[PDB]
Structure 1
Amino acid sequence: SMLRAQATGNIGVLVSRVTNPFFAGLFDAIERELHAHGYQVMITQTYDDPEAEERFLKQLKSRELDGVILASVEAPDRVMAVAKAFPGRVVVVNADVQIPGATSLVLPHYQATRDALDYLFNQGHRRFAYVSGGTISGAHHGQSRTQAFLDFMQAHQLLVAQDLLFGQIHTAKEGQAVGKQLASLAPNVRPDAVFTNSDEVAVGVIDSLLAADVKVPDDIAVMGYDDQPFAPFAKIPLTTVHQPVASMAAAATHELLKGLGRQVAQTLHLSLKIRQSA
């Protein structure tokens, strides 16, 4: 009797944080398409637990999932080893890293960050605050936007102000703290523009600036990132970089379903959405 491996009908999707509306939207878009194809979905989050990635991968290795889509990566080499044992079954999307053995979709965030910063320079801005959810320094993956910022400053012969760099800032509440610090500065030490890397962060930064009677954008311009659902509804509607959630979700899910043998074989752009905040 020849016994062939039987599909579980379960797929894992990993995000950093589901209370980040960008990740919620990306998750929804992927999960609904998987669901429509008859799959159930395991979700995990890594924002407060790097170990969550290994636990997630163990579910694939132990044959409880048919495949996984990762929208964030902790340890590329660990994901790689799993991908090589599970060809066609590991897909990485929008994680600012390419994983050998896994179909990896990398979006042009270096380019988008350069373009957004050039937009700000062209509006007359010269002193820049830069906020990131990652660290300011490091040789690890996930640094494309920070390198774009540094390269931008070099190209326009602008000196980086180390006091205007804010690392490990992810949420609106953390943004409020950044904004309060910026509003505290003497007009001549204050940044002209803030690159927030997050619409959640931007909403918080703006709230604190306005609370201190600092005008946005007239005194300080604030650039968001993602074009999240609340962005057009913000107190100062957000100028922001638009992530193509629906298109990247469709691409990632297609790559996985092709790998699982369910679909037959058949460019993702970041753009700048201009509103009021910058």
Structure 2
Amino acid sequence: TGNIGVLVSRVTNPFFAGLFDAIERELHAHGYQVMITQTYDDPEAEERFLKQLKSRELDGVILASVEAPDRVMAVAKAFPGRVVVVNADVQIPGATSLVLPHYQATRDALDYLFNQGHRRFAYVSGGTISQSRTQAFLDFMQAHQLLVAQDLLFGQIHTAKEGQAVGKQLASLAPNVRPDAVFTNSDEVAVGVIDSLLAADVKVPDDIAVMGYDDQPFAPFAKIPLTTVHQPVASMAAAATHELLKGLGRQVAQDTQPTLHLSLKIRQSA
């Protein structure tokens, strides 16, 4: 039982740090040494990480972020059983790939908000908005015949500091053009957004409701405890770990599969 690599976009994202930790503690118990690499979504960093498998510095890898699916596919084909992909919004041929239902969770979270009476929506993403979650948002807006306001779309927003800038801009707006609710796609971003709203005496949720994503460790402890979409970190980590161990010939196949569920966690911020 040798070395395993885990690839994530950003280690300072507490969702990725938690996911790594859960994988690592279980693999460590099986005798493996586990190391994490971060990409900041650079495909060259992903390529370089994959060379560690190709050169057999690593016995296996678990990817939680994927930049170039076809490159991952080629490595998985050369190294069957040794590449697992988890919660990356993609199925990679040759690699056991676990996809969670982010489209459904996003539609459900948006339905929730609409049901609280919210009609003007800001949407924040880590990607450039021009993507299961973004399609869920667009589908949602179409279904309720709500006009998408481009002024309330925010792309490439990943951190709490970036969320602070978004919140400061939203707090600046006249009450009649201010969104009713903000879909942040990140508990980090949500904490920042909310902090800026409160600094400007914008009430949360009564003036602007803010929906998080992930249910990160800080979420229940936030100044306005976060309403958010809970990612089942422990369960997905266990599933990914088992798929890799099975592929490495360490573990037997099991009958009982997890169904990995995202769930809406209602607290105070929305």
**TM-score normalised by the chain length of structure 1:** 0.94
Q: Report the Cα distance in structure 2 between the residues aligned to 1:53 and 1:104, rounded to whole angstroms.
A: 17
Query: 1:225 aligns to what SS in structure 2?
Result: coil
Q: CA shift at 1:47, angstroms? A: 1.2
Q: CA shift at 1:135, angstroms? A: 1.2
**Could you report, residue by residue, the CA deviation over 1:110-157 in whole angstroms, capped at 9, with x for unpaired residues?**
0000000000000000000000001101xxxxx110000000000011
* One of 53, 61, 69 as aligned partner of 1:76: 69
* Aligned match of 2:256: none
Query: 1:134 aligns to what SS in structure 2?
Result: coil
* One of 47, 54, 57 as aligned partner of 1:54: 47
* One of 103, 106, 120 as aligned partner of 1:110: 103
Q: Report the Cα distance in structure 1 between the residues aligned to 2:41 and 2:263, rounded to whole angstroms.
A: 30
Q: Tell me the matched-pair count.
A: 265
Asked if 1 retains the 8 angstrom alpha-carbon contact of 2:5 and 2:61, the reply is yes
Asked if 1 retains the 8 angstrom alpha-carbon contact of 2:4 and 2:58, the reply is yes
Q: CA shift at 1:42, angstroms? A: 2.5
Structure 2 gap segments, 5+ residues each: 254-258
Asked if 1 retains the 8 angstrom alpha-carbon contact of 2:90 and 2:99, the reply is yes
Q: Report the Cα distance in structure 1 between the residues aligned to 2:221 and 2:114, rounded to whole angstroms.
A: 26
* One of 198, 204, 215 as aligned partner of 2:203: 215
Q: Report the Cα distance in structure 2 between the residues aligned to 1:135 and 1:274, rounded to whole angstroms.
A: 28
Q: Report the Cα distance in structure 2 between the residues aligned to 1:42 and 1:75, rounded to whole angstroms.
A: 21
Q: CA shift at 1:197, angstroms? A: 0.3
Q: CA shift at 1:50, angstroms? A: 3.2
Q: CA shift at 1:63, angstroms? A: 1.1
**Could you report, residue by residue, the CA deviation over 1:26-77 in whole angstroms, capped at 9, with x for unpaired residues?**
0000011111111112211011643210011000000111110000001000
Query: 2:210 aligns to what SS in structure 1?
Result: strand
Q: Report the Cα distance in structure 2 between the residues aligned to 1:190 and 1:97, rounded to whole angstroms.
A: 35
Return closer, same or farther for 1:48/1:251 CA change in 2, 3 Å cut-off: closer
Query: 1:168 aligns to what SS in structure 2?
Result: coil
Q: CA shift at 1:277, angstroms? A: 0.2
Asked if 1 retains the 8 angstrom alpha-carbon contact of 2:190 and 2:210, the reply is yes
Asked if 1 retains the 8 angstrom alpha-carbon contact of 2:41 and 2:67, the reply is no
Instruction: Tell me whether 199-208 or 49-58 shows the greater mean CA deviation.
Output: 49-58
Q: Report the Cα distance in structure 2 between the residues aligned to 1:48 and 1:227, rounded to whole angstroms.
A: 22
Return closer, same or farther for 1:48/1:86 CA change in 2, 3 Å cut-off: closer
Asked if 1 retains the 8 angstrom alpha-carbon contact of 2:215 and 2:231, the reply is yes
Q: Report the Cα distance in structure 2 between the residues aligned to 1:51 and 1:170, rounded to whole angstroms.
A: 20
CA RMSD, Structure 1 to Structure 2 (Å): 0.8
Q: CA shift at 1:86, angstroms? A: 0.7
Q: Report the Cα distance in structure 1 between the residues aligned to 2:42 and 2:84, rounded to whole angstroms.
A: 21
Q: Report the Cα distance in structure 2 between the residues aligned to 1:38 and 1:52, rounded to whole angstroms.
A: 27
Q: Report the Cα distance in structure 2 between the residues aligned to 1:181 and 1:170, rounded to whole angstroms.
A: 16
**Could you report, residue by residue, the CA deviation over 1:175-208 in whole angstroms, capped at 9, with x for unpaired residues?**
0000001001110100000000000000000000
Asked if 1 retains the 8 angstrom alpha-carbon contact of 2:164 and 2:193, the reply is yes
Q: Report the Cα distance in structure 2 between the residues aligned to 1:224 and 1:48, rounded to whole angstroms.
A: 21
Stretches (4+) displaced over 6 A: none
Q: Report the Cα distance in structure 2 between the residues aligned to 1:277 and 1:222, rounded to whole angstroms.
A: 5
Query: 1:159 aligns to what SS in structure 2?
Result: coil
Q: Report the Cα distance in structure 1 between the residues aligned to 2:158 and 2:65, rounded to whole angstroms.
A: 14
Asked if 1 retains the 8 angstrom alpha-carbon contact of 2:42 and 2:67, the reply is no
Q: CA shift at 1:273, angstroms? A: 0.4
* Aligned match of 2:7: 14
